[PDB]
Design a binder for this molecule. Sequence first.
Ligand SMILES: CN1CCC[C@H]1c1cccnc1
Ligand SMILES: CN1CCC[C@H]1c1cccnc1
Ligand SMILES: CN1CCC[C@H]1c1cccnc1
Ligand SMILES: CN1CCC[C@H]1c1cccnc1
Ligand SMILES: CN1CCC[C@H]1c1cccnc1
Lengths: 208, 206, 206, 206, 208
Amino acid sequence: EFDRADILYNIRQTSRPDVIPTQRDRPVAVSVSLKFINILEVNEITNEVDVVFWQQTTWSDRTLAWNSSHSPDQVSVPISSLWVPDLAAYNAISKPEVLTPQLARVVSDGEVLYMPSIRQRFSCDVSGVDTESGATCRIKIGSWTHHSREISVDPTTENSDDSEYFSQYSRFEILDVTQKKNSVTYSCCPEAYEDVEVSLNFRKKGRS
Amino acid sequence: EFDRADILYNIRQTSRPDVIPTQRDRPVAVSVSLKFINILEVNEITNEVDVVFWQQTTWSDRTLAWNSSHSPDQVSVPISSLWVPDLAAYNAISKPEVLTPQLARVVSDGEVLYMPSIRQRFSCDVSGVDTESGATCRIKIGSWTHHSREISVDPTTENSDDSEYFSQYSRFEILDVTQKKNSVTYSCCPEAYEDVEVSLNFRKKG
Amino acid sequence: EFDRADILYNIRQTSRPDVIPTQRDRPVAVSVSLKFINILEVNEITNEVDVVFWQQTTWSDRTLAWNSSHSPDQVSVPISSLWVPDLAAYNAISKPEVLTPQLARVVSDGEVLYMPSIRQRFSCDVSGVDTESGATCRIKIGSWTHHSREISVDPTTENSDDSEYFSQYSRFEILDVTQKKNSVTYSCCPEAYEDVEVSLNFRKKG
Amino acid sequence: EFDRADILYNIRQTSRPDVIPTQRDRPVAVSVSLKFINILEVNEITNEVDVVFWQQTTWSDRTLAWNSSHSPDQVSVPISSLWVPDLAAYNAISKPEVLTPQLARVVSDGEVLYMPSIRQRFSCDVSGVDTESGATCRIKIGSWTHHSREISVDPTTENSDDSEYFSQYSRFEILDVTQKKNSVTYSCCPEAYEDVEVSLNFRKKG
Amino acid sequence: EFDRADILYNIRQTSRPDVIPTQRDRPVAVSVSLKFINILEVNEITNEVDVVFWQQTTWSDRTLAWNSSHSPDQVSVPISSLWVPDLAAYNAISKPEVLTPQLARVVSDGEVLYMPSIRQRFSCDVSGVDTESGATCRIKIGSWTHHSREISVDPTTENSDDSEYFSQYSRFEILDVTQKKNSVTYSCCPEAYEDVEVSLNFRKKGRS
Ligand SMILES: CN1CCC[C@H]1c1cccnc1
Ligand SMILES: CN1CCC[C@H]1c1cccnc1
Ligand SMILES: CN1CCC[C@H]1c1cccnc1
Ligand SMILES: CN1CCC[C@H]1c1cccnc1
Ligand SMILES: CN1CCC[C@H]1c1cccnc1
């Protein structure tokens, strides 16, 4: 039997936050999904957008696991005590501003959910934002330093609505969100790195 | 008999800041209440507001308790030595800027009061800010990661006065502040998460 | 004979920066004085000012004391090794930007002087700033979490000119600086908290 | 046989982050190459530019090496656990804003690749930016404190296309990127310091 | 013989960074000299300037010394491991933005050179900036908390041109840099504090 204090103590003492939780030479499967909350600023001249999204991030780390047969089966853990995937947005032009407490939810089987609210600026196609078909801003996210044999990134499906959490008070409306996944070889390095491309189809609402 | 040094040493040494002070499998009851001090900027086109408020936050942590029959019965404690609720404003568009010393007041029975002055910008309904009925901006606050069996959130009880500490030098005036607690289920997760919705009814002076 | 290394070692090794240096039955007497250096921005529409001042802060901590019959009688100490009063400006709308090295001067009897240069923005009365009688901006400073029995705040007892070090290159000129102690209760808590109100009477130059 | 955990433990335990991995008194050869991603703001009046670039940095540190006959031959390491060259852009007018996770890739033979995305503002020649031949902004990068007997800086670009990773959505387009190795003695100090000058020839599209 | 690792270990283990390296009740002699790199913004209405300068700072700390008959005689050391003079500019209106790695160079006899590149804004006389005589902005630098028996501050000169490292792409040109030493008594305290005043004589380049 463990209480929350015991679980959290054991995790702090033994999770190796700098060690990717790879098992038998297989990639850590990371799921990412952006839930758009607001679009704060758009510039059709510069092709830049300022956006707030929840970055729902999910993966398994079995070194975190504990027998919860007589115990709580989930806890909140500061991310500084956990390994977290080194995800970056490749077309970000500002550093990610995390708006929320930096805590992940860890299940007793080792499943982790880290879902920060992030404000970040992007360079992307803003053309058509003012028309009915709208603009399509693509956001590319992947591990910065782990190639495909170490981290895979997936846009795991749901029925997950588009503007389920998007602000009704925004000047913009979301028409569609699609996720595409890619495998790229960069000039720097010989291995392929996976990314998810998130296409945000949106437009400016008219005053009426 | 303890002096302040002993109380604070004991809190610092046995601090478990990462551990939610859950007792008898009941949620930690957190009270929140926003005391509006200033509205610094409002944009009716973008529906954004920049606000300064004291986020009065209250809860009980029995692991902090000490016998105070012959001791001080209250101390100020760095929040880095305490568990603090992971509250977030859901419609915030900037990160909370804490303007005050990050100290909580702890009572010998384990009651904590943490009341930072916060500057933060929010996405909300700014329409009507210039009519007499004013605008109503809604701010939603709740635990980011603890569901309803772990953290409940409630309005601070004490009969809430609206303009109490609000700046007389602001360009805006407060007409009314109301609160409503909700219980919401999001698609990410199967459990319900509690929030308080704070409705700030305000208008431009003139 | 202690040398500076010994003094600073002893302070650092025994320092309890979390512990208010309450002397028996008494509030720690803190003296505060703002020496205005520059007024960088003024907005008469929003009633906001951006200011730079030296926050002269003085108090006694006898736990720091040492026998200096045959030793240096003063040293500079990082404030992270010292208890420091949790002062806040109640009408501040930005968090204090400290422009100087964060060192206090500690005398062998336990007297401490901490005098940071601070840039901060405030909400206050900017009306009349461009007139002959000028504007009067009031800045309210007090302990954020320590009530009247734990901290008292007074203006430094000197006659002194708080506009003495003000920049000659400023667009503004200071006409007068006055201070008044107040003591107030807040809805949150049953005790009185002390503050100093610093009234800065200033105007634009021609 | 070591697993990733062992490799990272061993590196962390013997991380000598402040020690330049000099061998027998001969300079650490550092390769630098800037991969331009975006040009965000250009001001022809002030001669200032705001740029985003991947700063591909490469060097060898044999103290990091491990036998990978039966082990992973590469790991990602927090740069806080590694010595990293003290490179600075001499004409930068803002501190480097690092946009990416601060991890370097370390090969079992001791080769290190650190490649942060950086946003930084520079002072340089913006004249002609809205002509056809374009502007040429020169960025000078070298070790801040290590002279030529301790750090050598070389452009290894490996010959990969200029506009390769540059945003197609930028307002600007890259015409050409060239590099020059320099060796400058400064008035302060008697030894020479190496730098690479990266010349970005770019324009506004039509 | 010590190697670099030994030197740095020994310094890390025994530097007392909060201890002023006073020897026998003498002041620590600190030399300061500003090498101007750029003038970014000037406002003649508000009397404010935004400047970039190398703040060349030099002093001796005998506790850092080591025998280098058969060892490297200089190392780079993080300033977090060293005592550094608590210098401040008295007319600065922003905090000193350090643009460079925060390393000092330490010689085996205990001489230290710390030379950060700093961007900072000042309140000073901007009048005359677009005439041929130019403006003269005075920058006052001294120890914040150490009086003259603990720290003296002294300007030092080289025969180099003041523009050696001034940007040729600035909108301003430097006409002259001079420096004065002062000893001032403030109201707070009974002791004299030393400062160096650095007078930057500059003007706007021809607009064409
Ligand atoms: C795959 N990353 C994305 C761009 C560069 C590359 C990389 C590789 C190794 C270390 N850092 C970055
Ligand atoms: C209640 N939170 C707000 C948005 C998602 C949710 C959540 C749940 C678990 C871990 N992180 C975030
Ligand atoms: C006197 N303080 C300033 C305003 C609220 C009050 C207070 C009391 C206890 C803890 N935090 C804040
Ligand atoms: C190469 N650096 C750039 C300018 C001065 C020089 C330097 C030398 C020693 C310590 N810091 C800086
Ligand atoms: C020399 N400094 C400049 C103004 C105040 C003074 C000072 C003295 C002691 C501690 N802090 C500041």
